[PDB]
Ligand binder design. Structure first.
Ligand code: QW1
Ligand code: QW1
Ligand code: CL
Lengths: 299, 302
């Protein structure tokens, strides 16, 4: 029993964190094989080709623990700088670079000076920001998932928006969201609630013995989506309904039956009650996160 | 900016997780140097659990009865001893991944990271607090016994918890790494219930200071309180008494935000009276009590 916001064990990622210093700027890098990936704003109206062409290999100081790595090459791929180093990371795990969709969750290994300080779980918001916890020096910290023994890198931290939320890229340097890596006026779009995730979390509450919110009612996908649109909830697709199938079979509560529970919660509130120790509807657990935590999958 | 429930990077602990098998029971062990620490109930059957005589059960065991597995490698047990409710299995190989470590016993209200494991394999990491009733509100399934709680301040891992059991309310009970249970619990299938839980007051105050550091002041008021008046009010909401030690501990946060501890106590009293009125504090509609004053300083400042 119990339901926690749980991150993947960060060990395979910790063994990849390095410190990248260039000029006055110091941030984090991800050392995989003989390449260190880091935000290109470490070289810093920025013409990044012009700024990068003025740098030599020895301008980038890469530090892996108490060992200085020597940079033998450098190239840019979108908003990510790839520093070729002489040494292949012996701690390089089996990995992939994956781009995630909004609503998908991942673990963040927050780092400062190439040293991991914390690990937390978070979701790619529908507005492409992440509600993370980062201070200055956190740039280059990575987001990942673990599938079997393979680490899928999905996020690299680049910046903080004026509302305190965060923006970054996939490991190929493509930003999530309409953001750019420069000091210009940028704001996160109006956020919405990840509906399939709230439903997954209601199923987790049912699995954990909390059923007060259940009701005899059902609804249609169209009628539920008319309610979802009114409460700034993401539309629930047939794919989401299919994805919630296993949880629906396990608890005996059809996805449209759980949708009517969610509809009543949105219109009437919780009425002094909590669900899994929360007075708000939690949307940062995917259906797979719920199944994984309520089954004990290991890595 | 931002405030998350953050766990310590689990890497130093992952490299210590092993699987311990005794008969039909399989649980997790912590391999540090040449010793594997695990709950002593690994030697029990389901029947033995009502009134186990651990000394009697352990005396009938030999080293080769304990199967220890570190990854895809079987370790050889060369000795065994019991220290309180933990079994210490001397093995023939020192763990090369043994980090700098300490065994620390924590007090209620203290937080720590839990590396939940099944079959000696880590599956997840989460942050939690030792409740005032000595239980932890964890996320544990059958086979998670032996999973550990820790903090990693600097490069040293301080092991503070080993999971032993789930109580009937879904909460968890365990021991420090010397085998001493937190709380009035026993490693027996007997009628045991967690005492009435209370809110960790000093932690809620620390979290209100984190909200101030992050720019949220909506809950502040023009009032102050005496420590005694705060405790009389707080007790009525099932909040732990706030001691002078807690007030002293909140000193740095008070100096940083410019809000006196007893002035922050007055905001808390008002929040308990009024609720949040549709608002949130650090993305939460409830008063969060699983961040200590030390956690707030670490995360908000560095
Ligand atoms: N003004 C300022 O501090 N920045 C400007 C800027 C402009 C563009 C880009 Cl791509 C990055 C940055 C950096 C950034 O956002 N870094 C930071 C990242 N995360 C959390 C922070 C908390 C506090 C301060 C910086 C954080 C630095
Ligand atoms: N009923 C049952 O299976 N147990 C009884 C028991 C009695 C005393 C002692 Cl010291 C340990 C145990 C074990 C224990 O609590 N393990 C478990 C630990 N954590 C979460 C669990 C979730 C679900 C089932 C067991 C969990 C095993
Ligand atoms: Cl303590």
């Amino acid at each position: 029993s119990g339901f926690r916001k749980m991150a993947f064990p960060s060990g395979k990622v910790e063994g990849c964190m390095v410190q990248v210093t260039c000029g006055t700027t110091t941030l984090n890098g991800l050392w995989l094989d003989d390449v260190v990936y880091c935000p290109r704003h470490v070289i810093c109206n920025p013409n990044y080709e012009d700024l990068l062409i003025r740098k030599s290999n020895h301008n980038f100081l890469v530090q892996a623990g108490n060992v200085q790595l020597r940079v033998i090459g450098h190239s840019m791929q979108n908003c990510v700088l790839k520093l070729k180093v002489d040494t292949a990371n012996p701690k390089t795990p089996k990995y992939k670079f994956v781009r995630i969709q909004p609503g998908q969750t991942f673990s963040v290994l927050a780092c400062y000076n190439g040293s991991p300080s914390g690990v937390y779980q978070c979701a790619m918001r529908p507005n492409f920001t992440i509600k993370g916890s980062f201070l200055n020096g956190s740039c280059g910290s990575v987001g990942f998932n673990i599938d079997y023994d393979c680490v899928s890198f999905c996020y690299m931290h680049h910046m903080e928006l004026p509302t305190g939320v965060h923006a970054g890229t996939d490991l190929e340097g493509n930003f999530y969201g309409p953001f750019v890596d420069r000091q210009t006026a940028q704001a996160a779009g109006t956020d919405t609630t990840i509906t399939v995730n709230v439903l997954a979390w209601l199923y987790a509450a049912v699995i954990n013995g909390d059923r007060w919110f259940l009701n005899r009612f059902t609804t249609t996908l169209n009628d539920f989506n008319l309610v979802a649109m009114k409460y700034n909830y993401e539309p629930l697709t047939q794919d989401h309904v299919d994805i919630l199938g296993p949880l629906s079979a396990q608890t005996g509560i059809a996805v449209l039956d759980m949708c009517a529970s969610l509809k009543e919660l949105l219109q009437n509130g919780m009425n002094g009650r909590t669900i899994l120790g929360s007075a708000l509807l939690e949307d940062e657990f995917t259906p797979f996160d719920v199944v994984r935590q309520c089954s004990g999958v290991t890595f």
